[PDB]
Amino acid sequence: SPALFNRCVLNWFGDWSTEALYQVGKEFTSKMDLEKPNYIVPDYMPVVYDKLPQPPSHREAIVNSCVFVHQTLHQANARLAKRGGRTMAITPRHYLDFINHYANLFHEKRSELEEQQMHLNVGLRKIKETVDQVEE
Amino acid sequence: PVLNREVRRTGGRVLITLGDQDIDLSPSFVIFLSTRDPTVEFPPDLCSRVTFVNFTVTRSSLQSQCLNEVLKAERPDVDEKRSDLLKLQGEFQLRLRQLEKSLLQALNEVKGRILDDDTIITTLENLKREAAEVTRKVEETDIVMQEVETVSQQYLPLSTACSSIYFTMESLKQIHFLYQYSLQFFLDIYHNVLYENPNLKGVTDHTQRLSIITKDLFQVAFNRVARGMLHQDHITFAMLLARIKLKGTVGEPTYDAEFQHFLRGNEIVLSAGSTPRIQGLTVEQAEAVVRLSCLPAFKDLIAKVQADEQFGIWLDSSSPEQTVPYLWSEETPATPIGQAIHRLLLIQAFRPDRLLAMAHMFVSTNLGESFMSIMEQPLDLTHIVGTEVKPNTPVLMCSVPGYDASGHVEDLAAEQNTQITSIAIGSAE
Amino acid sequence: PGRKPLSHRFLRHVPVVYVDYPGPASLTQIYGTFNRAMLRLIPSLRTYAEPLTAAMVEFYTMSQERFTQDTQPHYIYSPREMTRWVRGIFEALRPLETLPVEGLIRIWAHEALRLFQDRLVEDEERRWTDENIDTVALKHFPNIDREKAMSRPILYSNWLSKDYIPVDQEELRDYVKARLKVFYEEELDVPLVLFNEVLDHVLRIDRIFRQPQG
Amino acid sequence: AGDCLLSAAFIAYAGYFDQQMRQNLFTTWSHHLQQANIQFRTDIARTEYLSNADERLRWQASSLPADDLCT
């Protein structure tokens, strides 16, 4: 109603921008171990105009991919609305959910892999001890 | 507040506010919101707080279901290879890890005694074999994937036909209120054609089994749907199945323009310049000729009818659809189905009263002759009450107002020497 | 919306008067009276009371011709917006003393941004608003420099100092980031990140929380 | 890293969509990851990455359809 809009100072809390999504992803994936020194810098793949380095690293590439995923969800909703409809709004809450899922899944799978590798090393040491026993 | 997962954690205890009330947020609490209506537009406030888990069956979902079912049935080796490929990611690795853990716990239990060697050795060698198998599986991944791709491409048209058939059958409710069909009905049809196929008792060649499965699927779906479907609508369902098969068949044109003109394009603005043509043609026949000649294959329709001398005789024939003169102009010879489509357009133009009859002809030229022959025969439904009907599924006998269907069931019960407790439902008792 | 037409049997008795929005002349008079009353706090700006009001109404008039309710349902402008503008300028000038014309124009532009620019949707509207704001500011204040105007942020805060003073963006961003860290450490349970839009919205919300009837 | 990214994006974003739309979104994400030179396991099927065999068997014993969409 126009009466509500008057007597109230209006503030357009617009949707999160590309740079906002990039910053959210970067500060929410800082704890995650994503540093790959052997990253090969590709061509193209532009999503965030202000990529922090001109040649991106692995972590910046991952965050750019995350914001690209959010943008592709927005574009998929737009296309679905274009050809027919029946869509559900994508919101920054979805982005936070996706980032939290990424963090939890990455940590869980990396922990499982590290546990299996440590078990393999323990088995190697025990079997070397058995080798010494057999030689004796 | 619950969806937002707000927590007023204070005093070493977890808290949450529900209205004016304050309540402890007990751990291991999950809430699963649910709905039954596929088409609901939730507000963004609710949309942001939930993960939408959609179980609605769609074209792609049913296509994948049918593909998996036919791959498991027809080609158990390809299905086994697919299962092996899926397992190779984590399940085979888990099995190998557990085998190695068993080796470790046996070796530390036996202390690696040289007398115990043999009990170790077999295990060790077996473990090697296991890894060797895994190694072989990781050395032949691409070949198995390309084989599975070839088989899936071979079986894809059947899955597309199955999905299209089910969705035509489901949409059949628009024609009449009594044509409500469920997904379980089509799944039963698919399982009956896939497993209980009398035409597949000895067929071994995979392509032959696939062709037999497709043909019997079309036939069985049509028979089961039309057994409980009005006689004036059998031709509609047969034409729809013919269209589905035509979209599925290869080596044929899509006939999109001809079909669109047949269904909807016949009603277009072409009344201007409706010449009387010949004495045989009437005003509506002239208009139909004008509309049909808009198509590229019939652009010379005017001269083609005017030059012909026996065309006027054909117009007054008892069954024009039997002998339809070759009138369309085509640069290259067409398949019999294209001939049927063009003659069907001609019959829609000239003598529309035979259209239905010619429609049947078209079906016999597309889905094969005697496709409707089962419908003409009397209802041998003793087989339909023996098998094809589960006890949980009732048998509804809907009769045209003024007809009685209790006679058929009473005679079959007498034949099958099974008692029936016939009850009239008019009274309250 | 929500209004039902009155019955003819009742309308027959009640004459109705269409009180439209006050015209540019009426607005100039009323808010020039308000500005002359407000600028008496700082004598050095008294002679600037008459032009300033004009600039304000000019912007309002332009801000009424563009941004019609057809474009967005909330693009509605009224003399209440002008009253909030005057009240915000007065609130900024209330504790502060010995202000040159520079500070007056700076708070004028800041209030114009916070009332007319942050309600817009597309970047085109915001850029149009900024250019027209500095255009009218230079039009009605020709002898003044652009010092109030090339400053792109134009932000005010009173956390760093004892009153509303123009503060640079970097140190305010650092302070707000520290406060946000403390806030989500004790009050909230989910980490909060501070990007530029968050800083702008926090500044707008604080400004609203300070003004009367805000 | 890329595989976990894809799985999380699927289980968080790729909901409410039909099977074709889910596959299209996953294909787009994988194509971007390839374009960004991010090493994700090629042709990864998300069904067993997020759920081992025993959970699948428990779900099947829990009256669940064997469709890939249902899994």
Q: Per the structure block, which two tokens stand in for B233?
A: 């609508």
| 3-state SS assignment for residue C166 | strand
Please name every residue paired with C165 in a beta bridge, in sequence order, or none if there are none: C157
- Whether the CB of B64 is below 8 Å from some CB of chain D: the reply is yes
| Residues on chain D touching A64 (C-beta within 8 angstroms) | 36
Non-local CB neighbours of C29 within 8 Å, separated by 6+ positions: none
Tell me if there are at least 3 CB pairs under 8 Å linking chains D and A. Answer: yes
* H/E run at residue B331: none
- Whether the CB of C189 is below 8 Å from some CB of chain B: the reply is yes
Residue of A nearest to D16 (CA): A88
Residue of C nearest to B5 (CA): C189
Q: Are the CB atoms for A44 and A65 separated by under 8 Å?
A: no
| 3-state SS assignment for residue B15 | strand
Residue of A nearest to B4 (CA): A93
Non-local CB neighbours of A45 within 8 Å, separated by 6+ positions: A61, A64, A68, D32, D35, D36
Q: Per the structure block, which two tokens stand in for C127?
A: 């850029």
CB contact under 8 A, A126 and B107: yes
Q: What is the DSSP letter of B36?
A: S
CB contact under 8 A, D4 and A105: yes
| Residues on chain C touching A24 (C-beta within 8 angstroms) | 193, 195
Q: Which residues precede a break in chain A, with C-to-N distance above 2.5 Å? A: none
Q: What is the DSSP letter of C16?
A: -
For β-strands C156-157 and B21-24, DSSP reports them as: unpaired
Q: How far apart are CA B186 and CA B298, in angstroms?
A: 40
Residue given tokens 């079997």 in the structure block: A127
| Residues on chain C touching A5 (C-beta within 8 angstroms) | 73-74, 76
Instruction: Determine the distance in angstroms separating the CA of A134 from the nearest CA of chain D, rounded to an integer.
Output: 38
Q: What is the DSSP letter of A37?
A: T
Kindly write down the DSSP assignment for every residue of B82-93, as one continuous string: HHHHHHHHHHHH
Please name every residue paired with B22 in a beta bridge, in sequence order, or none if there are none: B17
Q: How far apart are CA B147 and CA B141, in angstroms?
A: 10
Q: How far apart are CA B321 and CA B355, in angstroms?
A: 8
Find, among C60, C191, C78, the residue nearest to C132 by Cα: C60
| Residues on chain B touching D52 (C-beta within 8 angstroms) | 90-91, 94
- Whether the CB of B8 is below 8 Å from some CB of chain C: the reply is no
Instruction: Determine the distance in angstroms separating the CA of B46 from the nearest CA of chain C, rounded to an integer.
Output: 20
Instruction: Determine the distance in angstroms separating the CA of C201 from the nearest CA of chain B, rounded to an integer.
Output: 21
Find, among C123, C84, C119, the residue nearest to C212 by Cα: C84
Instruction: Write the residue in B48, B52, B103 that is nearest to A93 by C-beta.
Output: B48
Helices (H) and strands (E) in chain B, counts: 17, 2
Q: Are the CB atoms for C193 and A24 separated by under 8 Å?
A: yes
Long-range contacts formed by B381-384: CB under 8 A, 24+ apart: B381/B227, B381/B408, B381/B412, B382/B412, B382/B415, B382/B416, B384/B227
Q: How far apart are CA A56 and CA A54, in angstroms?
A: 6
| Residues on chain C touching B9 (C-beta within 8 angstroms) | 189
Instruction: Write the residue in B52, B60, B91 that is nearest to D19 by C-beta.
Output: B60
Non-local CB neighbours of B155 within 8 Å, separated by 6+ positions: B67, B70, B71, B74, B75, B210
The burial of B355, by beta-carbon neighbours within 10 Å (0-12 exposed, 13-18 middle, 19 or more buried), is given as middle
For β-strands C156-157 and B15-18, DSSP reports them as: unpaired
- Cβ-based contacts under 8 A for chains A and B: 38
| Residue C84, φ and ψ in degrees, nearest 5 | -65, -35
Please state, as a whole number, how many other Cβ atoms lie within 10 Å of the Cβ of residue B53. Answer: 11
- Angle B278-B279-B284 (CA atoms, 0-180°, nearest 5)? 80
- Angle B2-B8-B13 (CA atoms, 0-180°, nearest 5)? 105
| Residue from B58, B71, B84, B85 to probe the interface with D (highest D Cβ count within 10 Å) | B58
Q: How far apart are CA A97 and CA A94, in angstroms?
A: 5
- Whether the CB of D53 is below 8 Å from some CB of chain B: the reply is yes
